[PDB]
Protein backbone atom coordinates (compact mmCIF):
# COMPACT_ATOMS: atom_id res chain seq x y z
CA UNK A 1 0.00 0.00 0.00
CA UNK A 2 2.96 2.32 -0.64
CA UNK A 3 2.15 5.34 -2.77
CA UNK A 4 4.55 6.58 -5.42
CA UNK A 5 5.59 10.20 -4.86
CA UNK A 6 7.51 12.24 -7.43
CA UNK A 7 9.50 15.17 -6.08
CA UNK A 8 10.74 17.94 -8.36
CA UNK A 9 13.05 20.72 -7.22
CA UNK A 10 12.91 23.48 -9.77
CA UNK A 11 13.84 27.02 -10.58
CA UNK A 12 11.30 29.66 -11.63
CA UNK A 13 11.55 28.77 -15.32
CA UNK A 14 10.30 25.35 -14.28
CA UNK A 15 13.53 23.51 -14.96
CA UNK A 16 14.98 20.92 -12.57
CA UNK A 17 17.45 22.56 -10.21
CA UNK A 18 20.63 20.89 -8.96
CA UNK A 19 22.48 21.68 -5.74
CA UNK A 20 19.75 21.88 -3.09
CA UNK A 21 20.17 19.90 0.11
CA UNK A 22 16.83 18.26 0.90
CA UNK A 23 15.38 16.14 3.69
CA UNK A 24 12.18 14.16 3.78
CA UNK A 25 10.75 13.87 7.28
CA UNK A 26 7.84 11.93 8.73
CA UNK A 27 5.39 13.38 11.24
CA UNK A 28 7.48 12.20 14.20
CA UNK A 29 10.40 14.29 12.98
CA UNK A 30 12.39 11.34 11.74
CA UNK A 31 14.53 12.18 8.74
CA UNK A 32 13.60 9.46 6.23
CA UNK A 33 16.14 10.55 3.64
CA UNK A 34 18.63 13.32 2.87
CA UNK A 35 19.92 14.07 -0.60
CA UNK A 36 21.25 16.82 -2.79
CA UNK A 37 19.13 17.63 -5.85
CA UNK A 38 20.75 16.58 -9.13
CA UNK A 39 18.53 17.85 -11.93
CA UNK A 40 16.01 15.00 -12.09
CA UNK A 41 12.78 13.83 -10.45
CA UNK A 42 13.23 12.09 -7.08
CA UNK A 43 10.98 9.07 -6.46
CA UNK A 44 9.78 7.84 -3.06
CA UNK A 45 7.26 5.19 -2.01
CA UNK A 46 5.37 6.08 1.15
CA UNK A 47 2.76 4.51 3.40
CA UNK A 48 -0.15 6.51 4.88
CA UNK A 49 1.14 9.22 7.15
CA UNK A 50 2.01 12.90 7.16
CA UNK A 51 5.42 13.94 5.81
CA UNK A 52 7.47 17.09 5.15
CA UNK A 53 9.97 17.90 2.38
CA UNK A 54 12.47 20.31 3.89
CA UNK A 55 15.11 22.34 2.03
CA UNK A 56 18.11 22.62 4.36
CA UNK A 57 20.42 24.42 1.92
CA UNK A 58 19.87 26.22 -1.39
CA UNK A 59 22.43 26.56 -4.17
CA UNK A 60 24.12 29.91 -4.41
CA UNK A 61 21.93 32.50 -6.11
CA UNK A 62 18.80 30.74 -4.85
CA UNK A 63 16.45 31.22 -1.92
CA UNK A 64 15.45 28.49 0.47
CA UNK A 65 11.93 27.32 -0.28
CA UNK A 66 9.25 27.00 2.39
CA UNK A 67 8.92 23.39 3.52
CA UNK A 68 6.09 21.37 2.01
CA UNK A 69 3.85 19.33 4.29
CA UNK A 70 1.75 16.58 2.73
CA UNK A 71 -0.44 13.65 3.66
CA UNK A 72 -0.83 10.26 2.04
CA UNK A 73 -4.14 8.72 3.09
CA UNK A 74 -5.39 5.16 3.52
CA UNK A 75 -6.85 5.21 -0.01
CA UNK A 76 -3.49 5.99 -1.57
CA UNK A 77 -4.31 9.57 -2.53
CA UNK A 78 -2.07 12.52 -1.64
CA UNK A 79 -3.00 15.92 -0.28
CA UNK A 80 -1.03 19.07 0.55
CA UNK A 81 -1.50 20.55 4.02
Amino acid sequence: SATHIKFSKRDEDGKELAGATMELRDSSGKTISTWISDGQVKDFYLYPGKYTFVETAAPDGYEVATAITFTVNEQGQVTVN
Partner: peptide
Amino acid sequence: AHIVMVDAYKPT
Protein backbone atom coordinates in the same frame (compact mmCIF):
# COMPACT_ATOMS: atom_id res chain seq x y z
CA ALA B 1 1.73 11.96 -7.04
CA HIS B 2 3.73 15.13 -7.80
CA ILE B 3 5.32 17.42 -5.30
CA VAL B 4 6.98 20.46 -6.84
CA MET B 5 9.22 22.76 -4.82
CA VAL B 6 10.60 25.92 -6.44
CA ASP B 7 13.73 27.73 -5.35
CA ALA B 8 13.17 31.43 -6.15
CA TYR B 9 16.04 33.56 -7.48
CA LYS B 10 17.86 35.93 -5.15
CA PRO B 11 17.69 39.59 -6.24
CA THR B 12 20.68 41.76 -7.24
